[PDB]
């Protein structure tokens, strides 16, 4: 399970696709099993005091990698359903988290301040097929206050497949920071877009916007695992291709699966990762 030379990768994808995607099915099933002999604790996610702070009962934050909020002057005020996730050759390159609930808006923005995050990647719509996926944690216009964080919408650009919102935030304790949200608007929950190029462009533009030297890029959808994990793997493998001209989806995915449960939720999303890299390689 070593890295694959980029010049051999598209051929590799053809083989994985063949025979009703036998190879992809094997890879993904190996991913889903790779936790088998691993118990990973998530005591804080399961504590009664924190239950209401989880969007989904089955979607937890592993203790070892969870993002801690600085405690407030409650015993569990340190909890948010969020995990550090590695990037290419960089620990804690991302924070992967659920779509914030109204009850966690303050926690969410406090994390962003405390972690010095400058980029938010959002990969879900607020509502999909009439179903609630994420509450709107930013102001529709002008400014809104979440705890001691005041968020001000500065500009918006709406492209065909994603929207870029530029915010200014400040701590009432003032100190101000730019936060840019990259919001992909056409990616269904538990699904994949038909074409990978628009997501490839989205990943390239949102990744390039990362400022040195700043906090982890925050990535979320609704549960914060499926689309979120898919983004993280594509971004990370683009980096590896840039650095070493090799690709290691299977190995990198098995690794981050120890950092937050269920990253990359479906075989279809697993395949979509490969399609995006293929588009980059051939392009």
Binding-site residues from annotation:
189, 221-227, 265
Residues 6+ apart with CB under 8 A from 207: 217, 235, 238, 239
Query: Is 134 one of the annotated active-site residues of the chain?
Result: no
Cβ at position 127, least distance to ligand VO4 in Å: 13
Q: How far is the CB of 48 from ligand VO4 (least distance, A)?
A: 24
Query: Which sign, positive or negative, has the C-alpha torsion 139, 221, 208, 149?
Result: positive
- In the complex, minimum distance from the CB of residue 220 to ligand VO4, in angstroms, rounded to a whole number: 8
Name the residues that contact ligand VO4, by CB under 6 A: 124, 189-190, 221-228, 265
As a whole number of Å, the end-to-end CA separation of the chain is 26
- What gap in Å lies between CA 256 and CA 230, rounded to an integer? 11
For residue 99, the 8-state DSSP code is P
Annotated binding site for substrate: 189, 221-227, 265
Four-point Cα dihedral 186, 192, 193, 194, nearest 10: -160
Q: Which is nearer to ligand VO4, 65 or 222 (CB)?
A: 222
Give the residue with the Cβ less far from ligand VO4, 135 or 189. 189
HSE (side-chain half, CA atoms, 13 Å) at 90: 18
In the bound state with ligand VO4, the residue whose beta carbon lies nearer, of 93 and 96, is: 96
Per the CB < 8 A criterion, the answer to whether 121 and 218 are in contact is yes
SS3 percent helix, strand, coil of the chain, rounded to 5, is 40, 25, 35
Class of residue 166 by CB neighbours under 10 A (exposed 0-12, middle 13-18, buried 19+): middle
Residue 229 CB, shortest distance to ligand VO4, in Å, is 7
Pick between residue 149 and residue 256 the one whose CB is nearest to ligand VO4: 256
Catalytic residues: 221
């Amino acid at each position: 399970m070593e890295a694959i030379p980029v010049k051999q990768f598209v051929k590799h994808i053809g083989e994985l696709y063949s025979n009703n995607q036998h190879g992809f099915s094997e890879d993904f099933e190996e991913v889903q099993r790779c936790t088998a002999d691993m118990n990973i604790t998530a005591e804080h996610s399961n504590h009664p005091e924190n239950k209401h702070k989880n969007r989904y009962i089955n979607i937890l934050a592993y203790d070892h990698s969870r993002v801690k909020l600085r405690p407030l002057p409650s015993k569990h005020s340190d909890y948010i359903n969020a995990n550090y996730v590695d990037g290419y050759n960089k620990a804690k390159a991302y924070i992967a988290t659920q779509g914030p609930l109204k009850s966690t808006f303050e926690d969410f923005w406090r994390m962003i301040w405390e972690q010095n995050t400058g980029i938010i990647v959002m990969i879900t719509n607020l509502v999909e097929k009439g179903r609630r996926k994420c509450d709107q944690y930013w102001p529709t216009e002008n400014s809104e206050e979440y705890g001691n964080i005041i968020v001000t919408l500065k500009s918006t650009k709406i492209h065909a497949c994603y929207t870029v919102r530029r915010f200014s935030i400040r701590n009432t304790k003032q100190n101000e920071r730019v936060v840019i949200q990259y919001h992909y608007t056409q990616w269904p929950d538990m699904g994949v877009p038909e074409y990978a190029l628009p997501v490839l462009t989205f990943v390239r533009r949102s990744s390039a916007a990362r400022m040195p030297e700043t906090g982890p890029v925050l990535v979320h959808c609704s549960a914060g695992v499926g689309r979120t994990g898919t983004y993280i793997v594509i971004d990370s493998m683009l980096q590896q291709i840039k650095d070493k001209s090799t690709v290691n989806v299977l190995g990198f995915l098995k690794h981050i699966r120890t950092q937050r449960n269920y990253l990359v939720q479906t075989e279809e999303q697993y395949i979509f990762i490969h399609d995006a890299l293929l588009e980059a390689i051939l392009g």
